[PDB]
Design a protein around this ligand. Structure first.
Ligand code: NDP
Ligand code: NDP
Ligand code: NDP
Ligand code: GTP
Ligand code: GTP
Ligand code: GTP
Ligand code: GTP
Ligand code: GLU
Ligand code: GLU
Ligand code: GLU
Lengths: 501, 125, 501, 501
């Protein structure tokens, strides 16, 4: 962000990894099966961690496209595959002028550790195309996407069993449609799983309910899991719950907008919203719905009638919770002194530098880390991939059977009681509550996504708190998450004997 | 499948090579694959050999197969193994005995009481 | 490696390309059968040249190996594919600590243009592994080589119809054997052309006669084609021919040793040899055999009894012809003022910076450029690939038929003359000269390699001379070669309509 | 069979291998590159020879067919691949009740060493189906063949670049047609080389001129190369040449009939012919043409009008040359004392036991060994495979250009002499002899099969003679052949580093 506050993104994530490696090193050496404790054990542990951290594969591309006015342009693209310790690699595609090999490797490694934290059986990957999509027509972006797909597919950097992309900054449903159609019409014409080659697809194409809003819905769940912990909310000097709290979100895209929709729903009040244009502000609250309608209509948030063009940086606005939901390295050493919030919920990937971490720790500011908090996108992408593999809408085969079963179950209770308390207890109707009537046919896809997401966001939160307490890490939840991620990944390399995976 | 060696006479380094190689020769001739032929442990092989088999398969012929790790069973749990495979054969030895040891019709021809609480056994191996 | 004579290798080769592009730009715009100028024709031309310049594909690798001690090491590797305008890419593998993405991209592009100069139907590629092979056992190097092969094969960066590697610095026959065996035993088990996946193989494995010495044999042919040109030898102030000239060679490896073997054979005098150790010197001549025998025996050329340890840089030694046959960027701006030879024969790839080119021009020093002079290696690798595709030793099917044919041909002349000048002439024996008796059965593989190489080195030389005369380039033969390479490559992008090739 | 004269066919060929290994062991240790002559050289050499001996792969098959009357029948089949040191394995298919794993492994190893003797770049393989084809209809044999092909193809035991079968006993043109059609219509439908999956095909079907007679034509050439060697014919006490010698052939099938056709053509007289039925005899000569006509007409040779039913074993008939052209192990310990002939030309594979070798040596009987003498079939099969790879009839592109070229060559001589000896010389016509006129368009496919075969039969004979002298092996030409074969195969294992080839 600043100058000399601007570390190498990949090394910075390596630093987070090293932090966590220091703390579990003893525990890893502990539960080793192996021969003689010459702590050659210790060196074996440290050799495996050396294998995990670098990317295994990075493809760099140049390829031409023919612009709308007839000119030729060369555009560059990358896709890094950080780890294959679990076989389909997973990670999004970013269209931005900031894309580099540097940045794509960093995000690929975050994907590996994030999947381990939430227990999604994917290795990490990430792709980037070095363009500003503002400067291209829809016709041009289709050509760029379709061709990026074919160059990746010929070199084994996309495929249902190899590497499954997804949306990231400046890509969405529409690009994923183009990726899936290009794959399933060329290399994947005979693959029964061709459409599992990418996630974030439109629902009419093998998409899944809620994937668009999935990352924000998991930002809500991850904040709620900590905002309702008395142990943590006391060190921060705050009341548990949402009903009284304010937040600011940087970024009004896929992550920002839905984070703000869900927190607003549960009582919290949106105080400030920012984009690259600038920010808006209103201490009385901003409504997500009418702000979205405004942006859709005018292409900017600036000039929203029910708020204030805020001069003075979103990141330092006064609120309880600050949600970075845009680029990386937004909270720096020069920046953290004024942050004025007590909870930093990283919706973005890598939005805080290590020395901003130092500061936040000694002001008792809680950073809910990216590799836990934004993992809702990859969790629901995992559900979408599973759905394509199965070729049925969840519940489709069982709705009627379930509904009938549950009525006969309840009827069994009714008839059993009528038998006992016979003739002059009369009729004892056993009927579903209003809530059970909703579930009477069993889960649909929407139900699976919702409760599946909530289950893993909370199982993961409680593993991070368990770990932070056991190593006495206070509010350094980032280190706790990496400790968890490292332990999971390390076990696969143990039994395997490495050499590859 | 069978390999004519006595594994006690080999180092772990040597057994890894034997196993990884045996896998490749089988895979080239279509004698291992998720939809073709799925090996498993037997005498003197276990979790460890099954790891080597799955890794060798999924890193060569099966690099693009979404089901590469279904090429062998008995794998360690951290590797796509399943809970209880190690003890599975004995747990089914227990169930298969109990299904007959509680059958009065059969336990009578044998002159025995139903149930386990009063019986001795010997195991070879 | 110094501090401000040390340009980015890939950009530097781009610069050589740009000069050549300047000069043919008019001639490319000329022969365009397309609609009419609007000088959209001119924009089309430099849009195509913009597509040719960058590498299409670069794979970066990390993978672990088990050292002999039991320790784990991560080693890096790269392979760039510069162009697919001709389908099998071609280029060597370098094991060196100087290997990087930009070094591998630079060498890959030189391979494209060198193949075009000599009319070998391959696109350019190059691989690198970032190790110093002197620090590894043969066991360890086997491992590294066989790994590197499998990682390349899974991602389509090696294959008979995709990308065919070859030796480079610190690799040879032995590594090529490991590469071919690993390929043909895994991914290529059913490919009838599996052993065409790499060239430079041992003869017993589908190698071809003379590949080892092929680069030096083409260094000799390329010097001889210019050393016997009165027009050029006059601007330099020298006598045509080899019989009176001295040379120094930097590098005593695959290129250096055989360059020095062949020049010594045709009368020239080797005055100095260098390696990384240092150099040796003797103005009376060094013999290539006994120097080779000494190196094989002691592992160094320092201390050769028949010469004396030269202190003072082999590149400035006093000779007629200087042969850089080692690393790149050896002749720099700080260096060229004292070069003291009048012919610089670039056996190595990229051994002169652009800044040193400027100087050598003004001093009337003739640089025979790499993309012409060292192309003997890829020319004979092309023959080896063809041989593997055909599955016969040249001549095998025809030796006897050919030998019998030629004797009946000669007998036809004999009997025809005996018929006419009847018995006043007796017997008129028609028999082969001693030289025809050698060819009586037609060419063998050795004959094909020898005369095939001489034919292309010579045709290519005269193409460069014509071009240098027709644009009045003087001794800037480097620009003439790039003009030729650009014309050949541009030809394919024209009719194709680009978009993929 | 012969009771306690009846060794394990595979072990017996291993024994032949071992005697050759004895003799070159010193030589092999000689030209090893490598470092420590520590008597670890010697152990490497033996370790490599231990790898070469055993078959790498043996597929055993059971599969059902429905017989013509509706009954089901399981039939067994095998195919052994002895070596992959050269990539397409090669070897025939035998339909016989004597087929076993041990017979198929023995013949497969013979194929490896025979291909090495004649320098055909194939590893050895052999298949067998355990039936007596005289007990099946043509309908039934088609189903057995087409099915045997599919079971081999699914497990990678047939394919143009894997394993290429051919005829053997009781199979021919017809079966090879069925094999090629089954392959090219299922697994090979997209393979440009599908029809190179088997050799011995009918000419209309991608077969090659002379494959049918090729084995006998090479029997003739291999006898002729030794029958015209004064050095050898003197130890036997015979006159060089064919014009005054008799021979007997056991087996009147593919090998026997054509061996007898070619020897009869060059003056030798056929004295006795045998099959499983029995034999016929006439010291006065048997004509191959009319004997063939009789067999085609009556299905047996017994009762040929111009000969008498011989009762007393054709192997002991009184002749100069005995040609075993049927099964293996036909000349035994109990048998060799009475053999009567001075030259045993092994057309069959493995027709002589090792103990019969011992005897023949001490009676100064010359055994021309199988791995040299019958290698004409695989030599011309190699030509057929090459032909299918090239997709042109030899000469097709060049006939007219050759003819024209040869006329103008000759005209150059004519005009050159006319200008020198001007007027008083008149016209000096230069015209082809009658022999050159046949050749004037260059070789056809027939010409290359003929002269190609003669070239390799002769080059191989000399190499055996050279070797038998360098080791003072007398008439033990079998050991000389194995010495040659072992040297060539050992080559490939040296540079390779073994582990897969
Ligand atoms: N896409 C997904 O589903 C997931 C994304 N993430 C991470 O979340 C972040 C973005 O996600 P996403 O919402 O998809 O990207 P989008 O393009 O959907 O939205 C990006 C938002 O960030 C804004 N933005 C970009 N740069 C800046 C900046 N320097 N200052 C302020 N606002 C900025 C854009 O506004 P403008 O148009 O004004 O630039 C836009 O509103 C990245 O870190 C990404 O890796 C993580 C998990 C899932
Ligand atoms: N290999 C081939 O077939 C072809 C190679 N080339 C180019 O030729 C050059 C070398 O080829 P090759 O002969 O194969 O390489 P080798 O590794 O075979 O031999 C290299 C020689 O160069 C010497 N050398 C290396 N670095 C230096 C240095 N910094 N200063 C002085 N001497 C040095 C080495 O000496 P030491 O042992 O002391 O390092 C060794 O004598 C490279 O540029 C290569 O790309 C071009 C065409 C074909
Ligand atoms: N086929 C080839 O191209 C080559 C074959 N060989 C070897 O040569 C032999 C095959 O010759 P081929 O002509 O191909 O086979 P065929 O089946 O074509 O002819 C076989 C001949 O041998 C006769 N025969 C079989 N067993 C006996 C026996 N025990 N005693 C006497 N005669 C017998 C058959 O008689 P009936 O007709 O009554 O069975 C028939 O006349 C085998 O050893 C084979 O491996 C080696 C190199 C090339
Ligand atoms: N961009 C945008 N998306 C919306 C809006 N309202 C609903 N959605 C999304 O559209 C999809 C379908 O809506 P619903 O069926 O109501 O979703 P839901 O499962 O009930 O849960 P929610 O996501 O909380 O609405 C869900 O993913 C919503 O998140 C909106 O106002 N703007
Ligand atoms: N060798 C050995 N294996 C054990 C022992 N206890 C459990 N296991 C096996 O380890 C696996 C995990 O064990 P648990 O965590 O106890 O789960 P479980 O299904 O209750 O195990 P069991 O009922 O004992 O089979 C199961 O397959 C057990 O059979 C033990 O004491 N010794
Ligand atoms: N390193 C090295 N290579 C040699 C030497 N002599 C010959 N060679 C190379 O080894 C191969 C075999 O050499 P030859 O049998 O003489 O065939 P050639 O084609 O006439 O060899 P040259 O013309 O000398 O290159 C050829 O590639 C030679 O260039 C030598 O003394 N040292
Ligand atoms: N079975 C059999 N084959 C024959 C006979 N005569 C010729 N052939 C073969 O049929 C093929 C075609 O015959 P030709 O036109 O004479 O060809 P060729 O090259 O002149 O044949 P040869 O010199 O006899 O080997 C050749 O392979 C001959 O060997 C015969 O009488 N019986
Ligand atoms: N860009 C998303 C991708 C998630 C997915 O692969 O679905 C992330 O950072 O997690
Ligand atoms: N390194 C060699 C390799 C040539 C080849 O591909 O054979 C070169 O620079 O040309
Ligand atoms: N059975 C023949 C077949 C040769 C071939 O492969 O064509 C032999 O023994 O040599």
């Amino acid at each position: 962000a600043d100058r000399e506050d601007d570390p190498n993104f990949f090394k910075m994530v390596e630093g987070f990894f090293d932090r966590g490696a220091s703390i579990v090193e003893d525990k890893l050496v502990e539960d080793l099966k192996t021969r003689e404790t010459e702590e050659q054990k210790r060196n074996r542990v440290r050799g495996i961690l050396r294998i995990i951290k670098p990317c295994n594969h990075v493809l760099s591309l140049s390829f031409p496209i023919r612009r709308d006015d007839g000119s030729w342009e060369v555009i560059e693209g990358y896709r890094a595959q950080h780890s294959q310790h679990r076989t389909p690699c997973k990670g999004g595609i970013r269209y931005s002028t900031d894309v580099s090999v540097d940045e794509v490797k960093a995000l690929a490694s975050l994907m590996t550790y994030k999947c381990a934290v939430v227990d999604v059986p994917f290795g990490g990957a990430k792709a980037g195309v070095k363009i500003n999509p503002k400067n291209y027509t829809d016709n041009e972006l289709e050509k760029i996407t379709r061709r990026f797909t074919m160059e990746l597919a010929k070199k084994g950097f996309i495929g249902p069993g190899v590497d499954v992309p997804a949306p990231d900054m400046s890509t969405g449903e529409r690009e994923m449609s183009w990726i899936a159609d290009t794959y399933a019409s060329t290399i994947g014409h005979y693959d029964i799983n061709a459409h599992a080659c990418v996630t974030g697809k439109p629902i009419s194409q093998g998409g899944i309910h809620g994937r668009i809003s999935a990352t924000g819905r998991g930002v809500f769940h991850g904040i709620e899991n900590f905002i309702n912990e008395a142990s943590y909310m006391s060190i921060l000097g705050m009341t548990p719950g949402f009903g009284d709290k304010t937040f600011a979100v940087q970024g009004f895209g896929n992550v920002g907008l839905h984070s703000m929709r869900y927190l607003h729903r549960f009582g919290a009040k949106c105080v400030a919203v920012g984009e690259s244009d600038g920010s808006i502000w209103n201490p009385d609250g901003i409504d997500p719905k009418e702000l979205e309608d405004f942006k859709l209509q005018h292409g900017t948030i600036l000039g929203f009638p029910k708020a204030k063009i805020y001069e003075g940086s979103i990141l330092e606005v006064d609120c309880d919770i600050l949600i970075p939901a845009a680029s990386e390295k937004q909270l720096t050493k020069s920046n953290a002194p004024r942050v004025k919030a007590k909870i930093i919920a990283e919706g973005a990937n890598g939005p805080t530098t290590p020395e901003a971490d130092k500061i936040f720790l000694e002001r008792n500011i809680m950073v809910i880390p990216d590799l836990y908090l934004n993992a809702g996108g990859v969790t629901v992408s995992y559900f979408e991939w599973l759905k394509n593999l199965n070729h049925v809408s969840y519940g489709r085969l069982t709705f009627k059977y379930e509904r009938d079963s549950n009525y006969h179950l309840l009827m069994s209770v009714q008839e059993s009681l009528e038998r006992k308390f016979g003739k002059h207890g009369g009729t004892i109707p056993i009927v579903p509550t209003a809530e059970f009537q909703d579930r009477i046919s069993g889960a649909s896809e929407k139900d699976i996504v919702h409760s599946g997401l909530a289950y893993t966001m909370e199982r993961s939160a409680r593993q991070i708190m368990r770990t932070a307490m056991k190593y006495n890490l206070g509010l350094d939840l980032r280190t706790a998450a990496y400790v968890n991620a490292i332990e999971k990944v390390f076990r696969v390399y143990n039994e395997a004997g490495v050499t590859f995976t």
